[PDB]
Each structure stands twice: as C-alpha cells, then as structure tokens.
Design an enzyme around this catalytic site. Structure first.
Site, PDB file in Angstrom:
ATOM      1  N   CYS A  46       3.992  35.066  24.915  1.00 32.96           N
ATOM      2  CA  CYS A  46       4.672  33.802  24.682  1.00 32.96           C
ATOM      3  C   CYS A  46       3.678  32.642  24.744  1.00 32.96           C
ATOM      4  O   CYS A  46       2.495  32.811  25.053  1.00 32.96           O
ATOM      5  CB  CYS A  46       5.794  33.601  25.700  1.00 32.96           C
ATOM      6  SG  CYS A  46       6.827  32.150  25.392  1.00 32.96           S
TER       7      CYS A  46
ATOM      8  N   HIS B 103       9.159  37.779  27.204  1.00 37.13           N
ATOM      9  CA  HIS B 103       8.094  38.264  28.078  1.00 37.13           C
ATOM     10  C   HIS B 103       8.342  39.723  28.434  1.00 37.13           C
ATOM     11  O   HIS B 103       9.067  40.010  29.400  1.00 37.13           O
ATOM     12  CB  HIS B 103       8.009  37.409  29.346  1.00 37.13           C
ATOM     13  CG  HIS B 103       7.724  35.962  29.086  1.00 37.13           C
ATOM     14  ND1 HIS B 103       8.642  35.117  28.498  1.00 37.13           N
ATOM     15  CD2 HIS B 103       6.627  35.209  29.336  1.00 37.13           C
ATOM     16  CE1 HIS B 103       8.121  33.907  28.395  1.00 37.13           C
ATOM     17  NE2 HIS B 103       6.898  33.938  28.898  1.00 37.13           N
TER      18      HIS B 103
ATOM     19  N   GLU C  81       6.212  41.727  29.726  1.00 32.40           N
ATOM     20  CA  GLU C  81       5.346  42.149  30.822  1.00 32.40           C
ATOM     21  C   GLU C  81       6.100  42.203  32.146  1.00 32.40           C
ATOM     22  O   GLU C  81       5.817  43.062  32.988  1.00 32.40           O
ATOM     23  CB  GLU C  81       4.142  41.212  30.935  1.00 32.40           C
ATOM     24  CG  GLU C  81       3.134  41.336  29.799  1.00 32.40           C
ATOM     25  CD  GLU C  81       3.619  40.712  28.505  1.00 32.40           C
ATOM     26  OE1 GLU C  81       4.527  39.856  28.559  1.00 32.40           O
ATOM     27  OE2 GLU C  81       3.095  41.082  27.434  1.00 32.40           O
TER      28      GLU C  81
END
Lengths: 187, 187
Positions: A24, A151, A153
């Site tokens: 992002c 996101h 992650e």
C-alpha cells in the site's frame, strides 16, 4: 519527507525484469512512472503534497455513500469483489468470489482519468462493489507484477501463507522435490 | 634424544585415573615409574642408553632359539598365547586361544627380575609359547590399563576395530542408543 526517491526505486526494477510486490501507499507513485516511460506525461506529479497539476490521476476524495459522511477516511468493513480469474493473488484462496479485506488510505482513483490505462496492457483483476474504484491493478507482459491497496502482510497466518511474497519464491526456482529428500531423521 | 620427559608423561595420567593405550617402545619406561611410585627403586633408570645400572630390568637379549642365531632382532612370525580370560583385549576377538601377532623390538624382559611384579597387582594376561617373556602386562585396580608389545594400530581394518582405542570410547559414556534414533533417513 520523500517523493522523488520512491519513483526511481520501482521503475528501475521493472526494466531489469525484477518482480515486485503489492504494498500500500504506492498507487500514487505507480501511475507516475508508468505515464512517463510508456507515454510521456511529465505534468503528472505528486498529488498528495501540492494538488495543483492538471493531470492529477489519484486525488483526495472521501466516501460519499452510506455509513461515512463528509471528509472521512477510506477504510472499514468493505466487500472486495474480483473481476478476472486466472492470476497470482486469487488462485491461492481456492478460487473465491468475494473476499473480505480492509484498507487504510484516503486517496481514490478517478474513473474519468483511466482512459489511457484500458488501451494498453494495464488490466484490472480486482474492483469494488460499484465497479468504479480500481483498487487492484496489474501490468500485462510482466512475469510477476502484484499491486493492490490492502495489507496482506498483517494477515500472514502460520497456516495460510500470504498471496504476494509466497508466489514470488515459488515462481522463482520451482523447487518442490525437497520434502521427499528428507524423511524425518529425528523419529 | 629424549628419556626423561617420556617418564613423567605416563605416570601423570595413571595417578589422575585416566586410561591409557598399549603402544610399543614403552615397556622400558613403564617399569621405571612403577618401581619409584609403588616402591622406591631409583637406581632403575634407562637401559637402552647406558647399561651400567644394577637394577636393569629390561636389557638387550637377542633370540637364542631356532631360526635366528646370534645378535638378531626380536621379530617375525611368532605365536602369541594368552594366559587369563576376561580382559579388554581378548573379548573382542570372540574369545580366541592363539592369535598370530608380530613385534618390532629388540629388548626383552628378564625372568629373574620380575619378583616384585608378582607380589603386587601387576598380572600378566598374555605370555609367549615358553612362559618366559612377559610381552603383555596389566595393572590391577586401574579402570582401563592396556600395555603390550605388538602394534594393533597397523591392523586397524575397517570391518574389525582395534582392541585398545575402541574399548576406551565404549567404556567412557556407553552410548549405544544412537543407532535407533536415525532409522535410515535416506530411504
């Protein structure tokens, strides 16, 4: 505190056949290097600092629908619906159809300035529930190009690998004959 | 080119309960440290350099039997017959009775100066075919004491380990549960 160094760091890896990941806060700089290399739009610069250019693709537009009213932030429990099928960030979820993902940004893409993104090899393998916001973008011809807005992650569960960083290692050497070479020594 | 340092090197390991190995060219120095610590015979010194002492235990005596006549060397195809049974250099050969071993020395032990070796804990778990030459000596009370005249290191076959150096590691930690932990990983 940085707007020029982040542009030359992504355009150099794409020319040297190096794959990238979908992080992002990068959609504002990804449209700058793509318009200068494939075409030649120099007026399109940074819009999150000085919004005075004429070719401002991604600007600051809050939510004008239900729930959030006025100048708020583009986040919350939103439904993300894909558009295509065969890709690298969709086949790992067992071929879904509507995945629940959250974002953390405030700038949106204008649907009237995406005319030059459809006549080239810049497809959209992920849209929204209104078919207006292009949250997921992909560049055709590149061996491994991932770019989105959420996101993945933070959702890196130990029992479910993440879409982007795991697909880069698997598509690198394709070494799958390692599990058969062991055999559990400590048994 | 060395006669005093080799004496203090063997007696220091015996006092600190450390095991030893059976190496040749050591029977001349093993009888010196044993007569000074257990008793107190200072006159018994090195006999292979200056044979002028009165307590010369091991002197230079050639073979006076058949085959070799005159001042020759104590070596050749000789038959070695043991005397006792339970030990550390006999149980590894499947309980034999007559093993063919070769030597490489010229000094022999006198059968008339071994009076003080029988009244103590210095047994003989290996003699010859005439019961005169004490080629194998062993000190009682020590946890692992090996001393002989032949060279078992040159006979270290890959399918048959050597008597002395192998029995020291086995009697150290007695770790035999290691083969059951692997279980052939490359199967």
């Amino acid at each position: 505190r940085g707007m020029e160094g982040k542009i030359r760091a992504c355009q150099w890896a794409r020319e040297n056949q190096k794959p990238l990941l979908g992080i992002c806060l990068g959609l504002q700089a990804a449209v700058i290097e793509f318009a200068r290399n494939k075409l030649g739009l120099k007026d399109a610069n940074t819009t999150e600092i000085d919004p005075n250019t004429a070719n401002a693709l991604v600007i600051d537009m809050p939510e004008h629908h239900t729930g959030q009213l006025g100048g708020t932030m583009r986040l919350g429990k939103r439904i993300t619906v894909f558009s295509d099928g065969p890709s690298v960030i969709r086949q790992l979820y067992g071929n879904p159809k509507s995945v629940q993902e959250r974002h953390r940004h405030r700038y949106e893409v204008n649907p009237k300035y995406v005319h030059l993104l459809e006549e080239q090899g810049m497809r959209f393998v992920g849209t929204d529930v209104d078919k207006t916001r292009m949250e997921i973008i992909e560049l055709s011809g590149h061996p491994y190009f991932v770019a989105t807005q959420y996101h993945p992650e933070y959702l890196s569960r130990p029992l479910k690998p993440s879409p982007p960083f795991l697909g880069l290692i698997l598509a690198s050497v394709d070494r799958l004959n390692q599990y058969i070479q062991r055999g559990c020594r400590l048994s």
